Design an enzyme around this catalytic site. Structure first.
Site, short mmCIF file in Angstrom:
data_model
loop_
_atom_site.label_atom_id
_atom_site.label_comp_id
_atom_site.label_asym_id
_atom_site.label_seq_id
_atom_site.Cartn_x
_atom_site.Cartn_y
_atom_site.Cartn_z
CG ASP A 95 60.30 46.96 -39.31
OD1 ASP A 95 60.79 46.18 -40.16
OD2 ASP A 95 60.63 46.93 -38.05
CG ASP A 197 61.37 41.84 -41.21
OD1 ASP A 197 61.61 41.85 -39.96
OD2 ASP A 197 60.89 40.84 -41.74
CD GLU A 253 65.70 41.28 -38.76
OE1 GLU A 253 64.83 41.12 -39.66
OE2 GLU A 253 65.56 40.77 -37.60
CG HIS A 329 61.32 43.89 -32.26
ND1 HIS A 329 62.37 44.41 -32.96
CD2 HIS A 329 60.71 43.02 -33.09
CE1 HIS A 329 62.39 43.88 -34.18
NE2 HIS A 329 61.41 43.02 -34.28
CG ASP A 330 63.37 40.18 -33.16
OD1 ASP A 330 62.16 40.08 -32.94
OD2 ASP A 330 63.81 40.52 -34.24
#
Ligand code: CA
Length: 557
Positions: A95, A197, A253, A329-330
């Site tokens: 990430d 990210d 993302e 994870h969100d």
């Protein structure tokens, strides 16, 4: 390209496996569970961030890009994980979190000291308004203002996320260089790619204009918070300076991205990224722009899902490339959010999987999705996420735009922590996650939902996912075929066709609890089909009477 043909497994490592007993998942724990992931069949792992961080945002606030957070292990453990991934013929994506750092990063600890500090311009500092207030009315995604005042130096610094996540200044070439040197450090040591990210936020509107004032809220999140004037320039520079030098995969993302933006990031001729995560399909169950944001819930609407997924499939059909995900994870567990997680849990999990894996793009499997993990019944006081804490304070306590009961209901549907309770390995204490005490409790339904029971049950969601991944590796139409929505107006059935080199793949899924009917359109009525997968036990696909959550994929013969 191996990234087009991949199936990615996303690990949230603090919640995956705790080998050393402190309750915190660790890098050796990941190593010990790689055989499980390979047996599922994923060939790429995306690890959520393990870099040193004080964990204000659970690793997305990085304080050292070149060392691990101590509870994950050391860099030596990371290098071993890279090696163990490769020994299994898999790839590892890390990430890349470079819109912002921790306020405890040495860069920021220096930046904030004085205007003359060499790190002052690594971050984004602005004078107060004449009355002392913030430079403008921009909001943070985790509530309140995007600006925090530093008394020492008399300026505010920008943070789109938490006050402990100051945004980097990408106008400073030294900062861009620092990022590229981080990327090469890891890529030279075998990292195969990056999940980037909040990549659309790296370029700012450096005039920092106010948003038109709303009247419904004091701080605004809107169009300046992404797609800045130099965004694509920077991503193109990162490709020239870094990505073009390695055999790698990149996924951005991209909250806020629409289909045309996706083509700017993902068209190969633009030399940017390979693919992006859009949020448009995650956005179908909120109002468009309530002050309560994603917490202003709407019920699942299949027609909205079909329209959005279809626009993405057709928009990137012959240029660029899609990602395919329902979980990360969100995001909550999709079967709890939008489906049945009780008597029809298996059928429903398999039905959402079939809708997704039948499409063009790279599929992402979030840890536990493959065993049908579900949302948690834990009380609000047990949640960990700063996003919840900060939204309770703003929406419920201070601004009173949500009632207590409405906020609790919304968090039970969408809180990020539903994704973050530990992975469920067996039916023993803490689901086999830890021999100690887990950092957050394991979901109370783990005794019925876990890897052990899944591997013992031939009708498991696990084996269904394993089969979808096998099919993808066996049938090139699943990778390369085009896409056509069928029976578009049907409020229960999501059906579509892929075509490739004279072969057809028909995907028919009843995303509802009630009976439905699929009838093939006229041009397909004289096709002969072979069923490749179904989630009910008992091939005339021109007419299918569908049971609750029934899913079938057929190939033409
Ligand atoms: Ca541990």
């Amino acid at each position: 390209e191996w990234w087009k043909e991949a199936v990615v497994y996303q690990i949230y490592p603090r919640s995956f496996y705790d080998a050393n007993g402190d309750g915190f998942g660790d890098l050796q724990g990941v190593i010990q569970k790689l055989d499980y992931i390979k047996n599922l069949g994923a060939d790429v792992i995306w690890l959520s961030p393990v870099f040193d961080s004080p964990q204000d945002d659970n690793g997305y606030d990085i304080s050292d890009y070149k060392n691990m957070y101590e509870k994950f292990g050391t860099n030596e453990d990371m290098f071993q994980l890279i090696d163990e991934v490769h020994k299994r013929g898999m790839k590892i994506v890390m990430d890349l979190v470079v819109n912002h750092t921790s306020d405890e990063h040495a860069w920021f600890a220096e930046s904030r000291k004085s205007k003359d500090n060499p790190y002052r311009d690594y971050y984004l500092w602005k004078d107060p308004k004449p009355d002392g207030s913030e430079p403008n009315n921009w909001g943070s995604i985790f509530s309140g203002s995007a600006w925090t005042y530093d008394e020492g130096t008399g300026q505010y610094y920008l943070h789109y996320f938490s006050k402990k996540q100051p945004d980097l200044n990408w106008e400073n070439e030294a900062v861009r260089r620092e990022v590229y040197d981080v990327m090469r450090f890891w890529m030279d040591r075998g990292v195969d790619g990056w999940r980037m990210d909040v990549i659309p936020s790296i370029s700012k509107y450096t005039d920092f204009p106010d948003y038109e004032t709303d009247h419904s809220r004091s701080y605004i999140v809107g169009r300046y918070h992404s797609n800045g004037p130099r965004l694509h320039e920077f991503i193109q520079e990162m490709n020239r300076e870094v990505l073009s030098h390695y055999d790698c995969m990149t996924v951005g993302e991209a909250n806020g991205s629409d289909i045309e933006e996706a083509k700017k990031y993902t068209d190969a001729s633009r030399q940017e990224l390979n693919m992006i995560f859009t949020f448009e399909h995650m956005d179908i169950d909120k109002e468009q722009n309530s002050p309560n944001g994603k917490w202003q819930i709407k019920p699942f609407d299949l027609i909205a899902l079909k329209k959005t997924m279809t626009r993405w499939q057709t928009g990137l059909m012959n240029v660029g490339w899609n990602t395919l995900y329902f979980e990360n994870h969100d995001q909550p567990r999709v079967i709890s959010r939008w489906g049945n997680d009780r008597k029809l849990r298996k059928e429903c999990a398999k039905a959402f999987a079939t809708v997704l894996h039948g499409m063009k793009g790279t599929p992402f499997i979030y840890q536990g999705e493959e065993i049908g993990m579900v949302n948690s019944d834990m009380p609000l006081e047990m949640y960990d996420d700063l996003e919840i804490k900060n939204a309770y304070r703003e929406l419920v306590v201070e601004n009173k735009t949500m009632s207590e009961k409405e906020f609790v209901k919304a968090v039970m549907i969408k809180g990020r922590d539903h994704a973050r309770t530990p992975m469920q390995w067996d039916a023993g204490k803490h689901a086999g996650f830890t021999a100690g005490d887990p950092w957050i409790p394991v979901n109370s339904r783990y005794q019925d939902i876990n890897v052990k029971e899944s591997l013992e049950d031939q009708d498991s969601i696990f084996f269904y996912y394993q089969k979808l991944i096998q099919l993808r590796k066996q049938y090139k139409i699943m990778i390369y075929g085009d896409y056509q929505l069928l029976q578009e107006n049907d409020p229960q059935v999501f059906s579509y066709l892929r075509e490739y080199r004279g072969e057809k793949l028909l995907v028919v899924v009843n995303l509802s609890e009630e009976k439905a009917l699929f009838e093939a359109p006229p041009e397909l009525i004289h096709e002969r089909w072979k069923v490749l997968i179904s989630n009910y036990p008992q091939a005339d696909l021109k007419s299918i009477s569908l049971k609750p959550y029934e899913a079938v994929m057929g190939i033409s013969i």
